[PDB]
Amino acid sequence: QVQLVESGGGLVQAGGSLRLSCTASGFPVAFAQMKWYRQAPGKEREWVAAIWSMGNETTYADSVKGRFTISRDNAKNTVYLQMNSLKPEDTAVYYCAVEVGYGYHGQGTQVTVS
Amino acid sequence: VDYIAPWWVVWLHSVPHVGLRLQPVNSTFSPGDESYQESLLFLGLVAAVCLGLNLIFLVAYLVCACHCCITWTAVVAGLICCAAVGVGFYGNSETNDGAYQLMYSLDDANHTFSGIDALVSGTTQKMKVDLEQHLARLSEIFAARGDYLQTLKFIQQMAGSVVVQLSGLPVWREVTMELTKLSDQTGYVEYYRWLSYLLLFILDLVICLIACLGLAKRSKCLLASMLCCGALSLLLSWASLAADGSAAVATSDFCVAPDTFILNVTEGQISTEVTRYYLYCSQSGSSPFQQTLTTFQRALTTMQIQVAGLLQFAVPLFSTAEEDLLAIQLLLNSSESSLHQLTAMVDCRGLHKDYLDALAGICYDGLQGLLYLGLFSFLAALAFSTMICAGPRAWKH
Amino acid sequence: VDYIAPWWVVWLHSVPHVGLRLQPVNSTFSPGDESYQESLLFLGLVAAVCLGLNLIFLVAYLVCACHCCITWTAVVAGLICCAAVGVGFYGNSETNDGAYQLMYSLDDANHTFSGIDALVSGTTQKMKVDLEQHLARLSEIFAARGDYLQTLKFIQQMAGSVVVQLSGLPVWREVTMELTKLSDQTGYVEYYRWLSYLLLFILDLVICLIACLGLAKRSKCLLASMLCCGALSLLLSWASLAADGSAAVATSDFCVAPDTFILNVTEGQISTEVTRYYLYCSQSGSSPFQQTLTTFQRALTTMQIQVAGLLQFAVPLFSTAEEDLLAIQLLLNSSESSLHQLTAMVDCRGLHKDYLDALAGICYDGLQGLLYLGLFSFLAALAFSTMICAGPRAWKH
Ligand SMILES: *[C@@H]1O[C@H](CO)[C@@H](O[C@@H]2O[C@H](CO)[C@@H](O)[C@H](O)[C@H]2NC(C)=O)[C@H](O)[C@H]1NC(C)=O
Ligand SMILES: *[C@@H]1O[C@H](CO)[C@@H](O[C@@H]2O[C@H](CO)[C@@H](O)[C@H](O)[C@H]2NC(C)=O)[C@H](O)[C@H]1NC(C)=O
Ligand SMILES: *[C@@H]1O[C@H](CO)[C@@H](O[C@@H]2O[C@H](CO)[C@@H](O)[C@H](O)[C@H]2NC(C)=O)[C@H](O)[C@H]1NC(C)=O
Ligand SMILES: *[C@@H]1O[C@H](CO)[C@@H](O[C@@H]2O[C@H](CO)[C@@H](O)[C@H](O)[C@H]2NC(C)=O)[C@H](O)[C@H]1NC(C)=O
Ligand SMILES: *[C@@H]1O[C@H](CO)[C@@H](O)[C@H](O)[C@H]1NC(C)=O
Ligand SMILES: *[C@@H]1O[C@H](CO)[C@@H](O)[C@H](O)[C@H]1NC(C)=O
Ligand SMILES: *[C@@H]1O[C@H](CO)[C@@H](O)[C@H](O)[C@H]1NC(C)=O
Ligand SMILES: *[C@@H]1O[C@H](CO)[C@@H](O)[C@H](O)[C@H]1NC(C)=O
């Protein structure tokens, strides 16, 4: 029993800033396991960022390092992704996921860079 | 350490065991069977028969001597009588040592089984009842905070899993009762038997010394009562040899294949895997309890992770219910200590050492004391027969 | 169960300790210091002085009687000799039982310590080498990990934590070496002493038989050889009384407080926390191994769940290092087995039972055997003196 709500997606211009919020209801955010994924229309779903449960240790892929920061908002039960210095190939459907067994990936938040 | 049958058990077990009709009967230990009982009373009656033959020899020789060297043989009879008392003292002491070793091993098994059962009951009650009460309190205070109620339901589910996997363990209530009954019966029989044999040895030494006293000097009229007491102790010694031989044969038939007998006695009360695990330690194999203990410890670790995170990530949002969250963590770590103790009690070595000690005790010490008591009975019968058949000896005129 | 303080140990410890020149000494077990050896040498010299006084009194009384019912007294002395031989057999059997029990308890403690060391060394080696090799292989084959290398890094971290905790466990190599040396010395000394005392029993029986044979016929050469051997045998009996009394005093005054002595000796060999846990079994208290075993269990559970997640979520993705991931899963299952085999051998129960059994062998049965052996030596000396007293009337009468 768990549900996923993604918010903040929209159409942006190259090099702006935006924050995506992936709401959680059945697993506490950054408390068991957290994960963020993306997928282009024709492509395979790809990892971008992740959070480890307790120590707030975060890692980012090579092509995305130093530009996005993903946070832990325990106050409102939400995970944020802070995207900075956007580039056009960052246009894809974004998701968050977990690998615990409470459930799986939810739905998408469309982010397009022009 | 390992158990193997020593030579004397093999020698005694090979002794024939037949019924009153001389029919061969399965020699496997089974006291419930009437046929095995009749087989051992067959040896009892054989001992009675040779006792009767020996008395017939005494009466015939006495009447032959009366109707129709000597003092050295009388002194020798006294000496072998004293040696018999000494050997019997040693044998009775060894048999008592074996019986007390068996009682101590049974008591150790009782304590280790009662510890397992007490830990099982305490952990089950603690977890289920107290954790559910506390968790209801947290759900009361943590209301309208979703993820916290989900984690609360998660720890409740893990508690249910712990309860199931912990109840899925043997419950040694009837086994504890059987061990207690065996210990009390062994204590009663052993104490009364030791008293009886000590009295017999005292009477043997007394009659030997006081019968030699008459032969020595002073009054000679004692010899009539000395003869009467010697005959009484002679028949008593024959009965003692009968009983000792029967008990030794039964104990040897038990000791040749003790594992099979124990495994086929505890067939319904105890599971087969558990008994085969305790009797034969599975150093190469896998402990049957391993899966349940693994699930127990995995669930406890998950509880500890969730509760520690809750303590660290719920002070600002609520600032309350931490007074019993510390309590639930204390309960969990006490249960962790209980788990360590439980996996230290269900280990094969703990009960296996007690069982091997009981086996060594019974077989080695008890049955060597038994054949030594039989040897005492044999020497006592020999010396008694010689001193009774020493003759009137002019009635010491 | 706790080692209750017995009574004869207290009585034998209550004897004054003087050493060499009337100094009160200490009467607290302290091997390897001058005062204790001086006290033991005092006791030995006391029995030597008693032997010398007995010899001088016997010679002087014999000369006085010569210069100035006896057969019955000689026979009584022979009977006392036989009874002393029997009681010496009992005492030697009890002493050998105690020595073998001590050796067996030390052997079982050695086995448990060797098992603990083998388990800790095996788990640390297996982890630090094979497990690190497997994550090294899996990390490189996993390309552009990101999410995955975090889990792999945490697995490596927590494996480091568990290996550090296991390194924190005491290493018992020196203790098992010392136990092996003590067991070997005990076996060698006990075997030689048992053989020597059996030879002494044989000598006593043989000399008593020769005395009884020579009492029948007044033969001068037989009497002379018999007396020459009897004086020698009585000097050995007195010397045996000396050694046995010294050893009994030492064992008794070690018995009055064994825990403090075994704690004093083990001041650098083993940390005081472990020894105070093993000697007492404070079942209502904590355990020094609780924290390291808890961390081991938590590490193993968490690595289990993480590796299971990676295995069940990576085969659909990569399916290339699957043999490696099954290998680490197998290593983790094996570490679970060794953990369940480890948290039971470090427990208080096994080593405390070993210690109590060793104490009972050395203190209950062992000291009883030594007291019986000293009583045998005293009885043999008395019987030999009584027999010698009949010597002057053995010649010409
Ligand atoms: C075997 O262990 C059991 C543990 O249950 C002991 O039972 C206790 O016995 C005492 C008297 O000795 C009673 O006062 C207790 O109430 C009993 N406890 C329980 C839980 O029933 C039993 O005594 C032990 N038996 C032997 C022979 O050692
Ligand atoms: C959980 O059980 C353990 C038993 O040792 C306790 O662990 C201690 O926890 C405190 C508080 O975090 C630490 O400062 C100590 O270092 C820990 N002790 C050791 C020996 O490592 C813990 O207190 C128990 N939980 C509760 C609520 O009592
Ligand atoms: C005490 O335990 C040690 C454990 O090392 C035993 O040493 C082993 O002894 C056997 C023969 O008994 C040898 O085959 C092994 O090679 C020895 N192992 C090592 C590592 O040296 C020792 O024998 C035990 N002592 C007693 C009296 O049981
Ligand atoms: C480690 O232990 C488990 C449990 O014994 C082994 O088998 C697993 O068992 C569970 C419960 O039946 C199954 O759900 C799993 O699918 C089993 N795992 C398999 C078949 O890979 C497990 O195999 C062991 N690991 C290794 C490497 O042998
Ligand atoms: C005794 O019982 C065993 C049980 O296995 C059986 O095989 C055997 O034939 C029986 N009889 C004898 C004489 O051993
Ligand atoms: C041995 O086990 C069998 C199993 O069927 C059982 O029927 C039999 O009664 C048992 N007998 C003895 C003597 O233990
Ligand atoms: C023995 O010495 C200790 C100190 O080592 C002292 O406390 C004690 O009084 C002394 N005397 C005894 C035990 O008779
Ligand atoms: C034994 O240890 C105690 C306590 O540390 C100490 O006082 C004493 O000197 C040590 N040695 C002896 C021989 O008692």
Numbering used by the authors:
A (entry chain C): 1 to 114
B (entry chain A), C (entry chain B): 6 to 73, 88 to 416
Question: What do the authors say?
Answer:
To facilitate this process for the ubiquitously expressed paralogue TTYH2, we screened nanobodies from synthetic libraries (termed sybodies)25 against the purified protein. These efforts enabled the isolation of two sybody binders that selectively targeted human TTYH2: Sb1TTYH2 (short Sb1) and Sb2TTYH2 (short Sb2). Analyses of cryogenic electron microscopy (cryo-EM) structures of complexes of TTYH2 with Sb1 or Sb2 revealed clear densities that were attributed to the sybodies. For the TTYH2–Sb1 complex, the data facilitated detailed molecular interpretation. The sybody formed contacts with both subunits of the TTYH2 dimer at epitopes located in a region with poor sequence conservation. To this end, immobilized Sb1 was used to pull down overexpressed TTYH2 in cell-derived membrane vesicles, and then structural characterization by cryo-EM was performed. Three-dimensional (3D) reconstruction of TTYH2 in the lipid bilayer showed the same characteristic features as observed in a detergent system. In this reconstruction, discernible density at the intracellular side seemed to correspond to the mobile C-terminal part of TTYH2, which folds up in the membrane environment or in the presence of an unknown interaction partner. Together, our results show that TTYH2 in native membranes can be recognized by a binder that was selected against the detergent-solubilized form of TTYH2.
TTYHs constitute a family of eukaryotic membrane proteins with poorly defined function. All three paralogues share similar structural properties as homodimeric proteins, with each subunit containing five transmembrane helices and an extended extracellular domain, which mediates the bulk of subunit interactions. A distinct feature of TTYHs is the wide hydrophobic cavity that extends from the membrane towards the extracellular environment, which is filled with lipid-like densities in all structures. Here we identify APOE as an interaction partner of the paralogue TTYH2 in endosomal compartments.
